Homo-oligomer: A and B are copies of this chain.
Amino acid sequence: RKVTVATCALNQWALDFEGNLQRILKSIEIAKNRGARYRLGPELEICGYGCWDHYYESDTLLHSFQVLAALLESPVTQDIICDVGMPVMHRNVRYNCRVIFLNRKILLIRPKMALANEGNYRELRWFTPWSRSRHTEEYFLPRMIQDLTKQETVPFGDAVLVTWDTCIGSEICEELWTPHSPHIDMGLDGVEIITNASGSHHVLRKANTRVDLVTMVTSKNGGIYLLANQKGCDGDRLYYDGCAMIAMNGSVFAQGSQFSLDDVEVLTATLDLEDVRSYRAEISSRNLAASRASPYPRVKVDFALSCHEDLLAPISEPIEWKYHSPEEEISLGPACWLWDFLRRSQQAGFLLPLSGGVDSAATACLIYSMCCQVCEAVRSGNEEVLADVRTIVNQISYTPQDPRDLCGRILTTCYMASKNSSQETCTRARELAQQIGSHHISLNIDPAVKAVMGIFSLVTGKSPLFAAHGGSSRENLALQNVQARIRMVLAYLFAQLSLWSRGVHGGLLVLGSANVDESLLGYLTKYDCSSADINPIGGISKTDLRAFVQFCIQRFQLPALQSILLAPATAELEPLADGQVSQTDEEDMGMTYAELSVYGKLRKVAKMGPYSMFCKLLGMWRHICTPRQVADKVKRFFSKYSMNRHKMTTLTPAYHAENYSPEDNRFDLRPFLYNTSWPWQFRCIENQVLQLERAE
CB of A93 closer than 8 Å to a CB of B: yes
User: Which residue of the partner chain B has the closest CB to A451?
Assistant: B451
A174: nearest chain-B partner, CB-CB: B285
Q: Given A188-B179, A475-B497, A616-B315, do A59 and B681 touch, yes or no (CB 8 Å)? A: yes
Closest chain B CB from A296 CB (angstroms): 12
Interfacial chain B residues near A577, Cβ < 8 Å: none
Stretch at the interface among A48-56, A362-370, A427-435, A545-553: A48-56
Q: Is the CB of B452 within 8 A of A477?
A: no
In this complex, the member of A56, A179, A275, A494 whose beta carbon has the largest number of chain B beta carbons within 10 angstroms is A179
A284 & B117 in contact (Cβ 8 Å cutoff): yes
Residues in B whose Cβ lies below 8 Å from that of A89: 277, 281
**Docked-complex contact B500 and A474, CB < 8 angstroms:** yes
Check: A649 CB closer than 8 A to any chain B CB.
Answer: yes
A94 CB contacts on chain B under 8 angstroms: 281, 287
Indicate if A587 sits at the interface (CB-CB under 8 A).
no
Does A464 belong to the interface (CB within 8 Å)? yes
How far does the Cβ of A194 sit from chain B's closest Cβ, in whole Å?
A: 13
Distance (whole angstroms) from the CB of A266 to the closest CB of chain B: 22
How near does chain B come to A287, taking the closest CB pair, in angstroms?
5
Determine whether A322 belongs to the interface, using a CB cutoff of 8 Å to chain B.
no
Contact A179 B190 (CB under 8 A): no
Given the contacts A312-B618, A488-B527, A609-B57, A672 and B125 also touching, CB distance less than 8 Å: no
Interface string of A332-357 (1 = CB under 8 A from B): 00000000110011100000000000
Q: Which of B282, B441, B527 contacts A118 (CB 8 A)?
A: B282
Q: Which residues of B contact A185 (CB under 8 A)?
A: 180
Q: Closest approach, in angstroms, between the C-beta of A275 and any C-beta of chain B? A: 7
Q: Is A198's beta carbon under 8 Å from chain B?
A: no
Which residues of chain A from 486 to 521 have any CB-CB distance to chain B below 8 Å in the complex?
486, 488-490, 492-494, 496-498, 500-502, 507
A58 in contact (CB, < 8 A): yes
Question: Which of A444, A664, A680 has the most chain B CB within a 10 Å cutoff?
Answer: A680
Residues from chain B with Cβ under 8 Å of A531 in the complex:
527, 531, 650
B482 touching A489, Cβ below 8 Å? yes
Query: Which of B17, B275, B474 contacts A680, CB < 8 Å?
Result: B17
Residues B452 and A493 in contact, CB atoms below 8 Å apart: yes
In the complex, residue of chain B having the shortest beta-carbon distance to the beta carbon of A692: B312
Structural contact, B132 and A125, CB atoms closer than 8 A: no
A284–B114 CA distance with the chains assembled, in angstroms? 9
Smallest Cβ-Cβ distance to A456: which chain B residue: B493
Residues on the B chain within 8 Å of A694, using CB:
none
Check if B456 sits within 8 Å of A481, measured CB to CB.
no
> Is residue A116 contacting chain B, with contact meaning CB distance below 8 A?
yes
Whether B441 contacts A445 by the Cβ 8 Å rule is no
- Are A653 and B650 within 8 A (Cβ)? yes
Asked whether B284 lies within 8 Å of A190 as measured between CB atoms, the reply is: no
Chain B residues lying within 8 Å of A527, measured Cβ to Cβ, are: 488, 492, 527, 531
**Which A446-505 residues have a C-beta within 8 angstroms of B?**
447-448, 450-452, 454-456, 458-462, 464, 472, 474-475, 477-478, 481-482, 485-486, 488-490, 492-494, 496-498, 500-502
A419 at the interface (CB under 8 A from B): no
For A315, give its contact among B14, B344, B501, B619 (CB under 8 Å).
Answer: B619
- CB within 8 A of A285: which of B115, B190, B283, B444? B115
Within 8 A of B (CB), among A646-673: 646, 649-653, 664-666, 668-673
Given contacts A93-B291, A282-B118, contact A478 B497 (CB under 8 A): yes
Closest to A695 in B: B311
Tell me if A63 is interfacial: C-beta within 8 Å of chain B: yes
| B284 x A497 contact (CB < 8 A) | no
* Chain B CB within 8 A of A290 CB: yes
Residue A624 is within 8 A (CB to CB) of chain B in the complex: no
With an 8 A cutoff between CB atoms, is A321 at the interface? no
B56, B216, B481, B507: which contacts A212 (Cβ < 8 A)?
B216
Contact of A650 among B118, B220, B489, B652 (CB under 8 A): B652
Assembly CA distance A292 to B274 (angstroms): 38
Query: In the complex, how many angstroms separate the beta carbon of A185 from the nearest chain B beta carbon?
Result: 8
Q: Are A609 and B60 in contact (CB under 8 A)?
A: yes
Q: Which of B93, B220, B489 contacts A452 (CB 8 A)?
A: B489
A 207-234 to B, binary, CB cutoff 8 A, 1 in contact else 0: 0010011001001110000000000011
Question: Contact: A671 with B289, CB < 8 Å?
Answer: no
A309 to chain B, nearest CB (A): 12
Shortest CB-to-CB span from A147 to chain B, Å, is 14
| Inter-subunit contact B606/A275 (CB<8 Å) | yes
* In the complex, chain B residues whose CB is within 8 Å of the CB of A314: 619-620, 622
A235: contacting residue among B187, B664, B671, CB under 8 A: B671
| A485 interface neighbour in B52, B443, B489, Cβ under 8 Å | B489
Residue of B nearest to A647 (CB): B533
Contact A180 B184 (CB under 8 A): yes
| Contact with A312, one of B458, B472, B619 (Cβ below 8 angstroms) | B619
Let me know if A101 is at the binding interface, CB within 8 A.
no
Q: Does A611 contact B (CB under 8 A)?
A: yes
**Is A300 close to B, CB under 8 A?**
no
Q: Does A240 contact B (CB under 8 A)?
A: no
Whether A179 lies near B286 (C-beta < 8 A) is: yes
Partner of A443, one of B315, B459, B620: B459
Check: A280 CB closer than 8 A to any chain B CB: yes
Is the CB–CB distance between B54 and A670 below 8 Å? yes
The answer to whether B57 and A679 have CB atoms under 8 Å apart is no
A52 and B669 contact, CB distance less than 8 A = yes
A566 within 8 A of B: no
Q: Which residues of B contact A620 (CB under 8 A)?
A: 314-315, 317
Tell me if A379 is interfacial: C-beta within 8 Å of chain B: no
Using A180-B185, A235-B674, A275-B606 as known contacts, list a sample of 20 further A-B pairs with CB atoms less than 8 Å apart, ordered by residue number in A: A21-B680, A53-B668, A54-B670, A57-B278, A58-B609, A60-B609, A63-B609, A114-B288, A118-B283, A125-B669, A209-B219, A212-B212, A234-B671, A236-B672, A314-B620, A447-B451, A474-B496, A533-B646, A649-B665, A650-B650
A-B contacts, 16 of them at CB < 8 A, read: A17-B681, A54-B609, A91-B291, A93-B290, A117-B284, A124-B124, A233-B673, A234-B671, A278-B607, A314-B620, A315-B616, A474-B497, A478-B496, A478-B497, A527-B531, A531-B531
